[PDB]
Amino acid sequence: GPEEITADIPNVGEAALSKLDESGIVYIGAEVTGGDILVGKVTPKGETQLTPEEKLLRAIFGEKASDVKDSSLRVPNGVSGTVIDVQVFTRDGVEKDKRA
Amino acid sequence: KDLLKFLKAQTKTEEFDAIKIALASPDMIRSWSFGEVKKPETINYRTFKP
Amino acid sequence: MKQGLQLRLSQQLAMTPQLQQAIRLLQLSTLELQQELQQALESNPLLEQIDTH
Amino acid sequence: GHIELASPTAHIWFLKSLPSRIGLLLDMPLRDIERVLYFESYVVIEGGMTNLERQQILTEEQYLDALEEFGDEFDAKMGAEAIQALLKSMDLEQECEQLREELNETNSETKRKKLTKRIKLLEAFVQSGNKPEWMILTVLPVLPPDLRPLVPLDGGRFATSDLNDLYRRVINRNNRLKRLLDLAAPDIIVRNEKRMLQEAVD
Amino acid sequence: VYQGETTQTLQDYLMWQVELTPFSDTDRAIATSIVDAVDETGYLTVPLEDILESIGDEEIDIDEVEAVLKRIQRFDPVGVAAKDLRDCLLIQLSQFDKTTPWLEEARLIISDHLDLLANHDFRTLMRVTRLKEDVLKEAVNLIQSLDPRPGQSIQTGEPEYVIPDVLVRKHNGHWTVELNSDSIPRLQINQHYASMCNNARNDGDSQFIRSNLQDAKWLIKSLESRNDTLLRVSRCIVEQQQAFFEQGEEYMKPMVLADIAQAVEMHESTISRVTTQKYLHSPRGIFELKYFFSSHVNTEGGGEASSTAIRALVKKLIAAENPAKPLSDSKLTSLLSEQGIMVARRTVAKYRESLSIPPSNQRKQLV
Amino acid sequence: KSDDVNGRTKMYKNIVDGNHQMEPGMPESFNVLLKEIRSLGINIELED
Amino acid sequence: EYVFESPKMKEILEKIKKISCAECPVLITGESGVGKEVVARLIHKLSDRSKEPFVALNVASIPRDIFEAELFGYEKGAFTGAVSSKEGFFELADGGTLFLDEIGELSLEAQAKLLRVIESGKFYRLGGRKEIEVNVRILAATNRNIKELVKEGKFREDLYYRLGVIEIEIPPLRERKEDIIPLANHFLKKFSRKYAKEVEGFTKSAQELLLSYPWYGNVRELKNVIERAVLFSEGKFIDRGELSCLV
Amino acid sequence: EYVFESPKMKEILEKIKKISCAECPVLITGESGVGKEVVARLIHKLSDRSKEPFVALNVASIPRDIFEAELFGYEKGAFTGAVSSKEGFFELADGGTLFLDEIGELSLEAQAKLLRVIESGKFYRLGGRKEIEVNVRILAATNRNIKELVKEGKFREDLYYRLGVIEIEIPPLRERKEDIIPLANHFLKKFSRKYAKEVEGFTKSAQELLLSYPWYGNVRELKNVIERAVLFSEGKFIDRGELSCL
DNA sequence: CCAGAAATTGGCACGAAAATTGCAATAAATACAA
DNA sequence: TTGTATTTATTGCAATTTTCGTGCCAATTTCTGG
Numbered sequence A: 001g002p003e004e005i006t007a008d009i010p011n012v013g014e015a016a017l018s019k020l021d022e023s024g025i026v027y028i029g030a031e032v033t034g035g036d037i038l039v040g041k042v043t044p045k046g047e048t049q050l051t052p053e054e055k056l057l058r059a060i061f062g063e064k065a066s067d068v069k070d071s072s073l074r075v076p077n078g079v080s081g082t083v084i085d086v087q088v089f090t091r092d093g094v095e096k097d098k099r100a
Numbered sequence B: 001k002d003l004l005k006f007l008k009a010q011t012k013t014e015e016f017d018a019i020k021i022a023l024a025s026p027d028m029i030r031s032w033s034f035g036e037v038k039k040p041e042t043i044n045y046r047t048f049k050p
Numbered sequence C: 001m002k003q004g005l006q007l008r009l010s011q012q013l014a015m016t017p018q019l020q021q022a023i024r025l026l027q028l029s030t031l032e033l034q035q036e037l038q039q040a041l042e043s044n045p046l047l048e049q050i051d052t053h
Numbered sequence D: 001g002h003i004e005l006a007s008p009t010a011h012i013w014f015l016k017s018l019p020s021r022i023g024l025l026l027d028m029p030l031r032d033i034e035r036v037l038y039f040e041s042y043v044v045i046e047g048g049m050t051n052l053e054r055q056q057i058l059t060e061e062q063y064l065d066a067l068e069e070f071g072d073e074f075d076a077k078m079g080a081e082a083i084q085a086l087l088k089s090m091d092l093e094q095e096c097e098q099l100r101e102e103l104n105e106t107n108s109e110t111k112r113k114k115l116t117k118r119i120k121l122l123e124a125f126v127q128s129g130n131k132p133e134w135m136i137l138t139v140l141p142v143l144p145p146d147l148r149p150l151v152p153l154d155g156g157r158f159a160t161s162d163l164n165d166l167y168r169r170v171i172n173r174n175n176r177l178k179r180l181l182d183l184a185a186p187d188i189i190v191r192n193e194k195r196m197l198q199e200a201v202d
Numbered sequence E: 001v002y003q004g005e006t007t008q009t010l011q012d013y014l015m016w017q018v019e020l021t022p023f024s025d026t027d028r029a030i031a032t033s034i035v036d037a038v039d040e041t042g043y044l045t046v047p048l049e050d051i052l053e054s055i056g057d058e059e060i061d062i063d064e065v066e067a068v069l070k071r072i073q074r075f076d077p078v079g080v081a082a083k084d085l086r087d088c089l090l091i092q093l094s095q096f097d098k099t100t101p102w103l104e105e106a107r108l109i110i111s112d113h114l115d116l117l118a119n120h121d122f123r124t125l126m127r128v129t130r131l132k133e134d135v136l137k138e139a140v141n142l143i144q145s146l147d148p149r150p151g152q153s154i155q156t157g158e159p160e161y162v163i164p165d166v167l168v169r170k171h172n173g174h175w176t177v178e179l180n181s182d183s184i185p186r187l188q189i190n191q192h193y194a195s196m197c198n199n200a201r202n203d204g205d206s207q208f209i210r211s212n213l214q215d216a217k218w219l220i221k222s223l224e225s226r227n228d229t230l231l232r233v234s235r236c237i238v239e240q241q242q243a244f245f246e247q248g249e250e251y252m253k254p255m256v257l258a259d260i261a262q263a264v265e266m267h268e269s270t271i272s273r274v275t276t277q278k279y280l281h282s283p284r285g286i287f288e289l290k291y292f293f294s295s296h297v298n299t300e301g302g303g304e305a306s307s308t309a310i311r312a313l314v315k316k317l318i319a320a321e322n323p324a325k326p327l328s329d330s331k332l333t334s335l336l337s338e339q340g341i342m343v344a345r346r347t348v349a350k351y352r353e354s355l356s357i358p359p360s361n362q363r364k365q366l367v
Numbered sequence F: 001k002s003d004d005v006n007g008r009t010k011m012y013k014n015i016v017d018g019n020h021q022m023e024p025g026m027p028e029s030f031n032v033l034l035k036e037i038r039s040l041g042i043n044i045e046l047e048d
Numbered sequence G: 001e002y003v004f005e006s007p008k009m010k011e012i013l014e015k016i017k018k019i020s021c022a023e024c025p026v027l028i029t030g031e032s033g034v035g036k037e038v039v040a041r042l043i044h045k046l047s048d049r050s051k052e053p054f055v056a057l058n059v060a061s062i063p064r065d066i067f068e069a070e071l072f073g074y075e076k077g078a079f080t081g082a083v084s085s086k087e088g089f090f091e092l093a094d095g096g097t098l099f100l101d102e103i104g105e106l107s108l109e110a111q112a113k114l115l116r117v118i119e120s121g122k123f124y125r126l127g128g129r130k131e132i133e134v135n136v137r138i139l140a141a142t143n144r145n146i147k148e149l150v151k152e153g154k155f156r157e158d159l160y161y162r163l164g165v166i167e168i169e170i171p172p173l174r175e176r177k178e179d180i181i182p183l184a185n186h187f188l189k190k191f192s193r194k195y196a197k198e199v200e201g202f203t204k205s206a207q208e209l210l211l212s213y214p215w216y217g218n219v220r221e222l223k224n225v226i227e228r229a230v231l232f233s234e235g236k237f238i239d240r241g242e243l244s245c246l247v
Numbered sequence H: 001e002y003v004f005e006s007p008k009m010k011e012i013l014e015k016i017k018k019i020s021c022a023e024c025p026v027l028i029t030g031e032s033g034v035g036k037e038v039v040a041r042l043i044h045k046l047s048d049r050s051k052e053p054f055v056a057l058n059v060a061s062i063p064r065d066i067f068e069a070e071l072f073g074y075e076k077g078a079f080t081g082a083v084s085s086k087e088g089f090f091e092l093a094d095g096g097t098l099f100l101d102e103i104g105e106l107s108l109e110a111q112a113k114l115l116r117v118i119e120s121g122k123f124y125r126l127g128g129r130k131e132i133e134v135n136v137r138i139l140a141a142t143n144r145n146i147k148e149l150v151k152e153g154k155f156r157e158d159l160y161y162r163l164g165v166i167e168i169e170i171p172p173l174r175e176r177k178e179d180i181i182p183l184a185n186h187f188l189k190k191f192s193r194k195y196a197k198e199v200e201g202f203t204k205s206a207q208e209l210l211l212s213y214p215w216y217g218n219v220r221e222l223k224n225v226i227e228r229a230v231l232f233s234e235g236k237f238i239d240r241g242e243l244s245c246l
Numbered sequence I: 001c002c003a004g005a006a007a008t009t010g011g012c013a014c015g016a017a018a019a020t021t022g023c024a025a026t027a028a029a030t031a032c033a034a
Numbered sequence J: 001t002t003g004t005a006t007t008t009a010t011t012g013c014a015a016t017t018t019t020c021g022t023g024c025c026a027a028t029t030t031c032t033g034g
Ligand SMILES: Nc1ncnc2c1ncn2[C@@H]1O[C@H](COP(=O)(O)OP(=O)(O)OP(=O)(O)O)[C@@H](O)[C@H]1O
Pocket: G001, G002, G003, G004, G031, G032, G033, G034, G035, G036, G037, G038, G142, G143, G219, G220, G223
């Protein structure tokens, strides 16, 4: 499956996603430091056999958390600044998000 | 059979006091190896296993 | 009239199939096709593959 | 690991590092050794009862006429098999004693230096446990894989390393030579395959 | 030459924490075995009896193994090397401060009744735990705030890709299909040995050379024919499914091998063999060539609707339902009927199961 | 400090424990050199 | 399920248990209808080749002229009309059991062709120059006294000692009077279930008549009599009148 | 691995050794189970053709109408269905040994077909015009009495003198009474090892019982009896009770 | 609140249609010797 | 001028196994009147 850029990362708290807009991209004018999330992305981990422990995990917590793994872009350590510009390049034939 | 001795035996240091160099016999080369390489393939690229 | 095994000169109408050869290459994927091509290269001295070395 | 070579191959360090150990040990010029190794000329192993020396360099037409005249009375070969046969049939003690007698009797300056060098080389070979035919490769060692890793790059491309490419070339040539030898292929092609295997190993 | 560097996995981090922990020799061996038994999600994969057997000494009881395991479970991240989900959640909750508003209720729910929460009862659970709906919502929210997979904090690895065989692109307003030139196999006849075919040369070499030359020519022709057949079949398939590449699924057409076989004038066995383990790259993604063949059901107008479109419609309808009252298969069937799709309840249940979607009673929330 | 794989770990543990002592071993690069020389068809080995 | 109650049948069963670890040829002898095929299939089931083929072959239905081609096979150009290679029965049952049923009807010319294959296990096809080696266990069944045939001269002496490594003889039903009533009850229940009748058992006089009759067809004749009695019954019990076929 | 202890069976071994330098055909006669196959393979092993093929052929298992095709081979186009040339058994066994097992069951029509190949080694393939010459040593074995059959008239006279250059007759086991006990011990050890039992000998009564039975199947019957005794054995010594099958 | 009624789900079964796998030499065109 | 040996051009049929949709019903969950 294809990687998706999204703000719905299952394993992170609500505070870390405060600076991302509805499309999963940081706002213009945000002050960021090392370890902050700039673009949220998930990678399809793939199908499994769905053993009863995995079924229990999916039933109790959810299905989104069990199908994708976080692969976001983060600020490198020892780097800070203000977000002044964001550019989005999309392949022809792919649907554009709201930011684009 | 004891795990302590098994783990301790792979952390030892060899003892030596000299270095020897010479020509290698075909029998010596065969004694070094653990198997014969027959195919030029490296990675399956499908299962990503050797 | 009789059931036996014999050697004789007869005049017969004969049917025969003609399909099986080169049809196995269609089902193979690209990797298996390359492996089979390498195996064919090993045995045939007159076959070569393009190289950049 | 190891690779079983279909035919013997000379070690380039003991051939192309001046002074040539193989040439100085066999008392042959380096040009003749190179010509014999890369399947360009013949060399006599056993002279027989004919007028042929034990290290005489022949050519294709000379070998053909020698065969059509004498027949099965002389043995001639080309490639690394001939060099290994020459190295395997030498007796070091007799060579050493004859060279020492010649050095004691004859007096010169350049010949003195040459005989001294060959005597020292032969006595070094005798004193150590090495044998001359070990300078011709029959089994090829293979380095452990973790010392020659593959390069992983973005997009799922592993590419390749130089050492792995050289190993692949050697293995391909060896396998083709094995298949050609076991099929009784014509000699005009197997000679070219042996030359290419020698070049790949070098 | 860049040789690459070393990375730290979960087990490397756990062993680093083990080495700096005041363990004895036997305790360190037990910890080594336990850390070896931990998988990438942070859960223990073998029973403690296997670890005790692997220690190899008869002087050691299971209680010492339990103590070492409890000590290891407090490493970073907390909850690693847990036996099951209940143990992991209890370990995580044990480290919370006592001032948390709903620690006790969450601990009670996790320790006693975890199957009811998994089955989405929300009715028998209230009776068993004697709680109201005001506190149950907060307790469930606190439970859902924990980490079910503590071992993914040190996640390592890389995705694996696939090289397509045919490329589809929209040029000049119409879709065009070509072969991927980076993966197309090709051969060539060695001109040296081929030109060695001298008539004056010995016949024994000449017959060998001629036979091998004709075999090489036959093999090259076979490869060319295979490539041409693959290109023709792929182009025909893309031409048939032309509305899919412009609007995705829900617009698939129902087609079988007979349609393509009639279109390209070949046998169904050839079409079956060609479209095996071969991929196609489109602006939408990478699809196997067998992805475009599907069954169908009837339609009120008189036409046919593919099963892929019905699965997509079912997923869309389920994903946009009311969490208070989830849709059942009878309700899903009556929603697809207004569009004229004549499908049975059992087929809708089969489609829902194929998408790995729980039944209606197990999807309801506590909103 | 560079390539004694066991020595690095032991030194780190001793430093954290407050014991400033080392147990040096063989550098890994010398083992790599030995393997590389052996791959050339030359028998090089350690004595005693 | 089968019924073994007589002491002789239990002794035969114990022998079958004991010889379960061997791969020797077995020769089964008896009268008609004693249960030779039952014993052969039980031997196959209790052996190490339980999941392997059990090729049962009637050696009297193979034509004389094509006898070799049926058991050994032939290559492509063995004779006129041979189009493709084909295996025999010794190669079809490789790794399993071959059951030669009614071996006493084989003519001497046909018996001479089975000499080397039984012991060696190796043979050549018809038109093949490569030796085929197989691993087949030989069970043979007959209802004629093989020893008497060998002494008379109607059976080859070289084959009896190859086949008769282990010999089992099944006694007639006339000597197994402890085994008659259970068989009658078994067949009665089977046929009552099959035909949906209402019979349940035999009267005491009927039991006496059944036990006193010198059965010549053995279990097959008993089964036929029970089936006829069930078919023509009308009452709850099968009295002496329904068994009017017996004299 | 074979047992040769009787005085009659050692003269045969000496005679086999003495003919190691010969290439004449050999004819082996006896009863059934005496060991004709053992003697034939020992003759082959102790000769100069030790590494050469040993083709054992049951001459009674070849169909009547394809006898020549099997023995000599055929060329392409010889008959309808001959799509390629195929060699025979005389070419298959070229340079080695051909063992015609059970030669006594060959019809008079089939005996006249191999009348020139035995002495000359030259023949023509079916549909072939060139003459083929082979170098094969012929061993034949039979349990009949070939001389008596020739006297009767059901065996060809011209074949007996082509085959019987050297004649070896193996006495029955009932007369080689020095071999019964060594053979019994050999077979007992073999079968005890194979079936993983604990038997290691016979009692005195069992030995006295094995020395009086008139073995009709000879060594094969003895082997069968020992195998039955081992399979049904219980203790460590085979008593007379286990040998009631005699 | 309780218990009977009703709706829901999935394992098994049925026929029908669709996909998969075994089979191995010929038809015809063209250049060459009388 | 022709009859014949050699070289390109043939990428299907026929069983057999597997998957499709949809009905029956036992077990389970949800609903509603007294
Ligand atoms: N002990 C038994 N229990 C149940 N049924 C039995 C038993 N013995 C024999 N039979 C039945 O007897 C019938 C005839 O027996 P079977 O087929 O073995 O005959 P047979 O010995 O091969 O005869 P024949 O020599 O006439 O071919 C079979 O249908 C079989 O089921």
